[PDB]
Design an enzyme around this catalytic site. Structure first.
Site, mmCIF file in Angstrom:
data_model
loop_
_atom_site.group_PDB
_atom_site.id
_atom_site.type_symbol
_atom_site.label_atom_id
_atom_site.label_comp_id
_atom_site.label_asym_id
_atom_site.label_seq_id
_atom_site.Cartn_x
_atom_site.Cartn_y
_atom_site.Cartn_z
ATOM 1 N N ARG A 1 0.820 -1.182 0.000
ATOM 2 C CA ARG A 1 0.000 0.000 0.000
ATOM 3 C C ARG A 1 0.865 1.248 0.000
ATOM 4 N NH1 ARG A 1 -4.260 2.667 4.385
ATOM 5 N NH2 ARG A 1 -4.616 4.476 3.010
ATOM 6 N N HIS B 1 -8.109 0.632 -5.916
ATOM 7 C CA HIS B 1 -8.306 -0.347 -4.849
ATOM 8 C C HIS B 1 -8.923 -1.568 -5.549
ATOM 9 C CE1 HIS B 1 -9.550 -0.839 -0.323
ATOM 10 N NE2 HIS B 1 -8.773 -1.815 -0.760
ATOM 11 N N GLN C 1 -10.614 -4.488 -3.334
ATOM 12 C CA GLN C 1 -11.887 -4.118 -2.732
ATOM 13 C C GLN C 1 -13.020 -4.368 -3.727
ATOM 14 O OE1 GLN C 1 -12.799 -2.699 0.508
ATOM 15 N NE2 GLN C 1 -14.773 -3.307 -0.372
ATOM 16 N N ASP D 1 -18.542 5.759 -0.284
ATOM 17 C CA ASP D 1 -17.317 5.701 0.491
ATOM 18 C C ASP D 1 -17.241 6.992 1.308
ATOM 19 O OD1 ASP D 1 -14.856 5.087 1.503
ATOM 20 O OD2 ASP D 1 -13.803 5.034 -0.413
ATOM 21 N N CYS E 1 -17.357 0.307 1.248
ATOM 22 C CA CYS E 1 -16.064 -0.319 1.497
ATOM 23 C C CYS E 1 -15.527 -0.176 2.923
ATOM 24 C CB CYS E 1 -15.034 0.218 0.503
ATOM 25 S SG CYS E 1 -14.896 2.009 0.515
ATOM 26 N N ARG F 1 -13.555 -9.686 1.254
ATOM 27 C CA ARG F 1 -12.213 -9.156 1.005
ATOM 28 C C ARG F 1 -11.280 -10.349 1.222
ATOM 29 N NH1 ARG F 1 -8.597 -5.008 1.203
ATOM 30 N NH2 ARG F 1 -9.406 -3.087 2.145
#
Lengths: 285, 285, 285, 285, 285, 285
Positions: free
Chosen positions: B91, B118, B121, B213, B244, B272
């Site tokens: 990340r 992402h 996700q 989000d 998410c 996930r």
């Protein structure tokens, strides 16, 4: 002229009081008149550091012959402080917290800066404009950027001196509608136009003063709100450029314009001292 | 089915690779298949903490029988890491820094999260939607709020699966024009329609999935994009709500809807784990 | 061959023990042999964080089938730790503190790094040299730069395997005189030569290995000890270049040499893994 | 013997459950019985660092064949965590927070330590006492110091196994009246006597175990509450000394006693692992 | 006579200016003369806090009857500061930064300390030497330690008043060769001699002043440069000991010498006030 | 009357010196006297920030016409400070450290506050009581809460003016027995009585002044030591309530009492200024 006990908002001054304050500032700056606060102490309470604001207020008090000191529920700290010093210049986030101090202090409270307004900056700005154009009424001020605390004070200040103002900001960053409505109310009595719009070039049309400040996607959103050569060329022929500082070259303004011959940014900054001296004298004098 | 070495962007997968990844995910989740990375170590390099991402990746590896370890020029650190572990879940902020590791690592690199995308996700979201409607093609997904990294992956993912998508964002918070263009490029060949709007209700109407989000004047600019009862009633009768996480009840979504019978947030969060197990097995298998 | 219970200093191994350890590392690496620490746990107590050292020790234990845990008077924490895990890889500043742990723990202690020595780095270096020359005795190694912890372990290590070593440093950055004397005393019986010098080109003359590390006015004091093309040309034709990492291109070494065909830096880093697997098996086996 | 889902307080275990747990702890320790949690993951969420606690819990799961991972409204955190891992050992300050997790996790939650109690420490203590005297009931435990979390769990633990207990603390530092009241209630059924006192010598009179912990003016207040040779002289002939650690030599205990022959502090410390293994197996088995 | 607008380097003062400055300092100190900066304000901008430097500058301005205030591109802050205060004493790291202020401020700038020089300290040291010996020219000053900022100012200061100077430092910490060359150039006209050596005893021989400062292996490198009874014994019969402070007893000086009868450290410290009153009066007067 | 050089403890003033001080403060407050410290600088060294103390001391020195400055082993820093300023008002934790400064400074040192005493606070309280009852002797002062620094100074102060004092505190938070003893000894000659009690309703009976401060399990110990309506009802009818501040409403005092008609807290706070002016005048005069 009589002034209200405090200066929390520019709206604490009516047209007469603002003009009296501006005249005093001019006289004190030029030595045409003198004031003294000897034996008096100014307390500074900044919930957030600000050297710029600290030095301008402090030197202002020194030239008035006074002393300065930089400084639990607010009602307690305010009441004890009211027992030690003679005036309070304070910077906080909430306009409401500022008001609580004024409510318990027992001494004059001055808004050094809040999220809502910055009365002293604009008194300094009005001072600078007057010195550049030999007048205030009928002039047009264009503010581009975020509808923030300085924008709010400008709306009230300009309207109170008969100066027209156009505030151009991105869609979600408009100034508080209640302040803009208050400014229009005032402008109706001084013969000034108050405008809140989206397009900066439209606001800049005919403007004698271009004014901006730091911005709050960021780029795309504020990019068009930059005082640059194009915005300048589209404004009144003798337009001046103001910025309350600090500045981010490349964002709200270009280095070219900032270091250009139309810039009065450094004189505007000095006037912070002269403006605040007048308020300190008027409220503590 | 050959997969590219890394999963930096959701676009590193063509419609076929994506569907394959999703199928593998389903099977592994239902035991309809079994994978094993025994003897291998997954290295996590998060330049910004994320317990949520870390735990789902770590348990995902454990269930595959592998081990996990949480972890100067990137080219140097990447080459040394490529000598100790067998895969990297990283990340970073910049999408390029991620490509940096992928370039020198010599081992598969997976995008755990970047400012730009992402991927994992969305694969999870696609899995959840699949399980809720028994299909993906033909459905309409409506995303409201900030055009951020998940919105980017959602655009690419929905398009790739024939799912129509309408993303409603405020004035200056639109998805990256390049990704949306690319999504539309995919949409034409899959039968879905990519819409990038301003009005949230326009996007929600007819939508089978309402997704949101966290948000980037703040309120003034985002209030209308909140997914609530009013907006829900607009989407399909059997519409689902995804988020998410983490969520700010009162902003992008209301507690009512989040804890409501339409919410699939928790299953979405669980997927996930299954989604990532599939990505790890596919690239390290 | 039998080992002392701990490895705090490379001097904890005599000539026979160091060779036994290197041989074990070679066989483990080729799979010519196998070791197992299943049911065992390695505690990593690093007062100073170090991902590079952490990862190589953790993967080393994992490949041996063991587990790992990353981690008041030390005698208290050591005795309690000695009741939970089966070995400690510790990184402290003072050699004395390291010995403190080894005295009370009741389980094997390994120097992961101290200001005074870095024995595991050297075991990995000796393995690397052997993989490039098919022998150790008779070779010549030149260390240029700061006479630090690695230089200390190199003095001892080289001396024990019959490798001649020349350490070149600035006037006040020489290695501990006591370690230099001890190395010379060992070399005297192994037919190796130990030289503590000031001139790097003298030390590099005909060297089979050129070794450097990060440096402790700073520029105008180390600049001459940089391993670059010029210095490499002073070394034997088959010379190899090592650096324990991390590296500062432009300082102790140039990108040219570091990335050039004489560099064995990456194999060297990988060998930390195989070297540490050897010590873990030897002390915890 | 069925166990409640969690172990938030020692009172979550009745006399039957506490005994079954100690029995399982003993059986596992002596290898008389084996358990396994293969495929399960223990999540550790310590809002306050605690190495001793983290190591004892991690080795406990490892020896059971499971894996462990070290880790916004808690109800969200807990619900998602409940979708990835199989159990949670958490250390917080407030007991309510711990209950929040247990309420939303959907998986076993174990109190690793809170301001209110420390159950796992007391199961380890009970285990230690049992190994020393061959029994529990009828024994007498004297706790001197601050009526804290361990004191609360001891009051409950001792009562449940019929061990009499006397806790002497300074006036304003007595344990929670509610826990004492609860302990007395339990003691009535087990034939044990609970005494909350002031004088430590009165408490130590005829005690088989002298127990203390770190204290919270401060000196003169707790000074007398120190287990030293003199205090040990008033207790039973075969009296043992326990301390949950860490210890402040010179305050609650002297070095002479702590290192003396009556001390079982290290054994006590090791039993944290054996006790915790039984709790894990019992709640996650 | 006349002075340059700023005091950025001791070299900003030719022989007549330095002497005029030292004379003024002495007259102000003995009250043989008076001066005042009433209505003037000195701004302090210390990028690296220094309470000793802040107090000496602040009390100097106070005794001169002025006020003091302790305080984005430097060119912006310099221009604004220049509109509020009458002088600036600044502490930066880069000499070049100090020069940026002087260029844009529009008011005198005084070097309160930089990585390159410390002129005000040296003017204070000179005053001290003069009071002890009744002269400056023909004396010999020995500086032992790190060729730092004070050493540079001593080189220029000493050469300018005809005082010979020997600077002894370790091989890699010699003074800027350019300041040494410049100092030797000045010395050629004043009859003094400049020597940059390695051996502290050679430097201290015949020296009337032994001078040291905090040091930048550490020990091995600097130990010999320590001023102690041994080094003091190599100096001239009437030798005095100076140290700009703060001091690390045991390193550059021993408590014995520092508290001994040859130390003038406290008078030197006091003279910071008298020398600075002179520079303020001379540049702002 | 002559005073000692410093005011480290209230016991540095005998009965005669305390009255003179109190008289000077009153005369100064009413303008029946005029002092002046022109040309002098007071340094404030607070090892613990205290805006309250800093403002009261700074405005005091300003009203006397002097300047103020807010400011390594103490003996070095004290000696240097003694060369720049004319007095030190200092806040430390240990009384001993305060003495270090006084010992080396060579200039008057005033205790601004230490863990042991708070002299200046008490001189302000005494001056407040006097202004309320026109006398000090014969009166009774009751203190409830923690036997801290102010309690200590109240003990010495009350006794010295012939005011009886009863101090009520929890068992382990009583005043230092040495000060209670020294207070009684003093009271023996002034005819006042000193009592260290446990019950606050006992101490308050017949008191003309109820005094409290912030508190040092915490609640269930200090809880009963709150000055509230009930406690007030047990004292004299003309009873006054004092609190040195800051206050924690709901703990040591109720909002009702603090804001009530018997409170003299605000007058007491203002008197910190008048009391400190008298000390500054007396010791630096």
């Amino acid at each position: 002229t009589r002034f209200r006990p405090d200066l929390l908002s520019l709206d604490d001054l009516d047209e007469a009081q603002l003009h009296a304050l501006l005249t005093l500032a001019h006289q004190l700056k030029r030595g045409e008149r003198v004031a003294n606060l000897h034996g008096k102490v100014l307390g500074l309470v900044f919930l957030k550091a600000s050297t710029r604001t600290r030095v301008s207020f402090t030197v202002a008090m020194y030239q008035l012959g006074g002393q300065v000191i930089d400084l639990e529920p607010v009602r307690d700290t305010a009441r004890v402080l009211g027992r030690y010093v003679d005036g309070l210049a304070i910077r906080t986030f909430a306009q409401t917290e500022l008001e609580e101090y004024a409510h318990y202090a027992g001494i004059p409270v001055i808004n050094a800066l809040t999220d809502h307004e910055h009365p002293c900056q604009v008194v300094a700005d009005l001072l600078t404009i007057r010195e550049n154009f030999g007048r205030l009424a009928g002039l047009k001020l264009a503010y581009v950027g975020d509808g923030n605390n300085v924008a709010h004070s400008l709306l009230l200040g300009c309207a109170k001196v008969g100066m027209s103002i156009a505030v151009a900001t991105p869609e979600g960053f408009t100034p508080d509608p209640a302040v803009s409505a208050r400014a229009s109310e005032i402008a109706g009595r001084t013969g000034a136009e108050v405008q809140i719009l989206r397009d900066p070039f439209e606001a800049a049309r005919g403007a004698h003063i271009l004014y901006t400040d730091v911005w709050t996607h960021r780029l795309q959103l504020f990019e068009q709100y930059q005082i640059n050569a194009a915005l300048l060329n589209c404004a009144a022929a003798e337009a001046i450029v103001l910025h309350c500082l600090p500045a981010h070259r490349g964002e709200e303004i270009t280095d070219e314009v900032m270091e250009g011959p139309r810039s009065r940014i450094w004189d505007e900054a000095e006037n912070r001292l002269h403006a605040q001296k007048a308020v300190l004298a008027a409220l503590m004098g």
